[PDB]
Write a protein that binds this ligand. Structure first.
Ligand SMILES: [Mg+2]
Ligand SMILES: [Mg+2]
Ligand SMILES: [Mg+2]
Ligand SMILES: [Mg+2]
Ligand SMILES: [Mg+2]
Ligand SMILES: [Mg+2]
Ligand SMILES: [Mg+2]
Ligand SMILES: [Mg+2]
Ligand SMILES: [Mg+2]
Ligand SMILES: [Mg+2]
Ligand SMILES: [Mg+2]
Ligand SMILES: [Mg+2]
Ligand SMILES: [Mg+2]
Ligand SMILES: [Mg+2]
Ligand SMILES: [Mg+2]
Ligand SMILES: [Mg+2]
Ligand SMILES: [Mg+2]
Ligand SMILES: [Mg+2]
Ligand SMILES: [Mg+2]
Ligand SMILES: [Mg+2]
Lengths: 117, 76, 51, 136, 177
RNA sequence: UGCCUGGCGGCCGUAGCGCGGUGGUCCCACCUGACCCCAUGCCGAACUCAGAAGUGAAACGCCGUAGCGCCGAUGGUAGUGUGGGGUCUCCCCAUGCGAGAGUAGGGAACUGCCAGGCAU
RNA sequence: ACUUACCAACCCGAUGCAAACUGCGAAUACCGGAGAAUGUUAUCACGGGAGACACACGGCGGGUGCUAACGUCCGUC
RNA sequence: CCUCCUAAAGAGUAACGGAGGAGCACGAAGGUUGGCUAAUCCUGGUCGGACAUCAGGAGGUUAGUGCAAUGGCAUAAGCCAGCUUGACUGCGAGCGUGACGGCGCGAGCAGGUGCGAAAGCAGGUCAUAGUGAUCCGGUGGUUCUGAAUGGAAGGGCCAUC
């Protein structure tokens, strides 16, 4: 399997379990250059909140968009935007990536900002 | 060598069909493998038995990229 | 068959025991597992004895 | 004598022989010998008929046998009561329905194929007809 | 490190003008170098596999992976999961350091060496060769070696054809016929 | 509002495969470096971290294209519930239901939420 | 190593066969919901009294037997 | 006793009908978290052959599943590693299957536990064989009983042989 299709396979079990539980998930996407976070409704077809390094307001205050510090910024941003809309309780979807480094930096910062998972 | 043997029939199959109103816990299908998969408000037992997790109506559907059979329970 | 019944006794002093089987040839060492003792209402260590 | 080289199972349920044949056209040769009746062709019957048509054409042209005796037939010998297991396989049959092209031929004139098929038909337990290849 | 610099500064340039590629990313790259020792006789004497693994570890500076029988075969009298060989996958710095050691000192020390074959390519650019004696490698001590053993060397490349793969190796002055 | 790209779904081949063409500002990809976080029953391949010199080659996306997959009538044929009948191993008639295969033909998906780049 | 009027799996095109084959797939039958008419409650529950557990032929769908038997074994009328 | 066909597309369905298998295994081959992906064929490669291990391509689950068969299985149920004992104790809405004795599936509740950052998952094993009622007797435990009374014997209850 190629990198993407191996990662999507690694992501499928947790996503089906969250779909079964009807959980609001905090979906993370990582790229060598950028990190993205989306709060998606239990239906899976609508994004309640979002934050990423492709956004000029977030990238301007960062050294490099694809590092752990940038990940912590995206995490703090999604959680703040989510709490402003009343979204508190979520479930983290690592999306086939390891719960480590940049992914873990985003999660730790989102939990710190007030998001419950 | 010699024949003459068989085992007891296991009484498998559908217990409750589409539209049937069931109470939570009710066995919907006794099967050997997952011919049918557990959908919303339906659980899968250790012998692949599908049962109601909520009170409601039995709903059979074909879902996903593999065109798999799923049994769910719709609230009435 | 070639597998014997053994009793796992509670270390908590209560006479409580779990019951299981063992291949005594391949595994001659006494089986030790942490199991729930319903007399002390806690998980304590259980050590093999003869049935 | 035709027979499956190996089978998944030795014995077969009697079954029935309802319906019309599949393989009703002359598919390989120019002429064909077609079943008009319903029945069973044994491997010995098929071999007897194959021999008759082959002698007739002085082993010239080409012959195709569209039928295969893949059905095992069991029999209980004399002085054996009912039950005590299914009998032993004695011979093989092809199930025949009205319309099966049994044999085909080419590389010979029509008059010779008609005669060779007339001789072969006299060995068979079921009524047959002479057929020719068609455009669709 | 030396031969990777040689690839960048001189090999890339040579292949670009040879095949007229539109992009530098089309230029064949030496992906990995795989060394293998098919022990086989390890089934009778278990110690023979350990000595083969220690030989491969000296030749290439990394811990060898002992390869087990994928399936059982009555012909060679081996059951599945039996340690029947050892391999090393070389990439980056270790692969290049090995590639130079192979061309510069190991391959010239072959008994009556006249040149390696240029036709032993898999049809897709990858090159495969075998060494009969492991003592050609100066990392192995003639006085300490228990037995004379051989090994397989496969150079996996990004070349689409044999003609492309040949030009990549020849550009490193790989001793061909 | 339009074009393009990323993420997450709906739908589950009319949606896939192949062949041809095409894209890098952005995004994506490969890519650079690796002591370290972290990783390899060996290997920085993968997982991972720090990055931006290079390239769209591969991959991926997009556009085209019926070689294949796939969808697919109408009509006929096969079966069959009920009632009747024959030359009753099998059929036929009245009535209702009516395939499978094949044929004409269709077909190079459609669609929602959010974000980014560009243009008016 | 070279070669042959022989045999030849796989693969491609064409042709059939299968109770223990299925990339298809009915009629019926069966489960469930609602509604009328009809039916001396025909239904369910509990309680008093049983009898019966050798079936036969005919139709249809089959196993067995020889698509033999006024044969034999199931299903259903 | 288990699997398939006969069995007529719900269940069930007979014959000295047609085919096979069980009377065990496993402290990991159980739990969980994280990861991984076959068979077969073509080409190249020391010893090395039709077949061992290595590399690439085709292929796409035809492999694998402790074992018969059938149904499942990629989110794998298949393969590996780290940590582990949920192979937990008390219960149980509601069902399935039985003439019955019984046998089965079960979310959820309480206590305590393992794994995971978390959502969660775990009351053995992909599922369906792997079994023996009652009586009598043995062992351990026990707010029960204890033939005048206090004990004890014996009996009960719970666990087990
Ligand atoms: Mg990289
Ligand atoms: Mg390209
Ligand atoms: Mg119609
Ligand atoms: Mg239809
Ligand atoms: Mg049709
Ligand atoms: Mg079709
Ligand atoms: Mg067209
Ligand atoms: Mg926008
Ligand atoms: Mg009564
Ligand atoms: Mg009786
Ligand atoms: Mg009787
Ligand atoms: Mg009767
Ligand atoms: Mg009679
Ligand atoms: Mg049935
Ligand atoms: Mg039926
Ligand atoms: Mg297992
Ligand atoms: Mg997992
Ligand atoms: Mg070879
Ligand atoms: Mg914890
Ligand atoms: Mg007293």
């Amino acid at each position: 399997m190629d990198k993407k299709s191996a990662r999507i396979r690694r992501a499928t079990r947790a996503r089906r379990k969250l779909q079964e539980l009807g959980a609001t998930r905090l979906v993370v996407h990582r790229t060598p250059r950028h990190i993205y976070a989306q709060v998606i409704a239990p239906n899976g077809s609508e994004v309640l909140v979002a934050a990423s390094t492709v956004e000029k307001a977030i990238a301007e205050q960062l050294k490099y968009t694809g590092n752990k510090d940038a990940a912590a910024a995206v995490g703090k941003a999604v959680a703040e935007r989510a709490l402003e809309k009343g979204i508190k309780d979520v479930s983290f979807d690592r999306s086939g990536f390891q719960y480590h480094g940049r992914v873990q930096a985003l999660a730790d910062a989102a939990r710190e900002a007030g998001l419950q998972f | 060598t010699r024949n003459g043997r068989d085992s007891e029939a296991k009484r498998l199959g559908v217990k409750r069909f589409g539209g049937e109103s069931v109470l939570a816990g009710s066995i919907i299908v006794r099967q050997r493998g997952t011919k049918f998969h557990a959908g919303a408000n339906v659980g899968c037992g250790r012998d692949h038995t599908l049962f109601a997790k909520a009170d409601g109506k039995v709903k059979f559907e074909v879902k996903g990229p593999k065109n798999r059979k799923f049994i769910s329970i719709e609230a009435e | 068959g070639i597998r014997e019944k053994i009793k796992l006794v509670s270390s908590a002093g209560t006479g409580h025991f779990y019951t299981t089987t063992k291949n005594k040839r391949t595994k001659p060492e006494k089986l030790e597992l942490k199991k729930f003792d319903p007399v002390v209402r806690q998980h304590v260590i259980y050590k093999e004895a003869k049935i | 004598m035709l027979q499956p080289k190996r089978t998944k199972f030795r014995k077969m349920h009697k079954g029935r022989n309802r319906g019309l044949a599949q393989g009703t056209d002359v598919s390989f040769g120019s002429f064909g010998l077609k079943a008009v009746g319903r029945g069973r062709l044994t491997a010995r019957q098929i071999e007897a008929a194959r021999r008759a048509m082959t002698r007739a054409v002085k082993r010239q042209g080409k012959i195709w046998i569209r039928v295969f005796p893949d059905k095992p037939i069991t029999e209980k010998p004399l002085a054996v009561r009912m039950g005590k297991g299914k009998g032993n396989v004695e011979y093989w049959v092809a199930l025949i329905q009205p319309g099966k092209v049994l044999y085909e031929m080419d590389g010979v004139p029509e008059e010779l194929a008609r005669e060779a098929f007339k001789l072969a038909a006299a060995k068979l337990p079921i009524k047959t007809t002479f057929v020719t290849k068609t455009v669709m | 490190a030396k031969l990777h610099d040689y690839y960048k500064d001189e090999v890339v340039k040579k292949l670009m003008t040879e095949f007229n590629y539109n992009s530098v990313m089309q230029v064949p790259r030496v992906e990995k170098i795989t060394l293998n020792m098919g022990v086989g006789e390890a089934i009778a004497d278990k110690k023979l596999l350990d000595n083969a693994a220690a030989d491969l570890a000296a030749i290439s500076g990394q811990k060898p992976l002992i390869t087990k029988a994928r399936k059982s075969v009555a012909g060679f009298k081996i059951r599945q999961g039996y340690p029947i060989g050892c391999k090393v996958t070389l990439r980056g710095e270790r692969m290049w350091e090995f590639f130079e050691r192979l061309i510069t000192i190991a391959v010239p020390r072959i008994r009556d060496f006249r040149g390696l074959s240029a036709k032993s390519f898999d049809g897709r650019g990858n090159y495969s060769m075998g060494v009969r004696e492991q003592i050609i490698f100066p990392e192995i001590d003639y006085d300490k070696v228990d037995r004379v053993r051989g090994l397989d060397i496969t150079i996996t490349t990004t070349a689409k054809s044999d003609e492309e793969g040949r030009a990549l190796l020849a550009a490193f002055d790989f001793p061909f016929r």
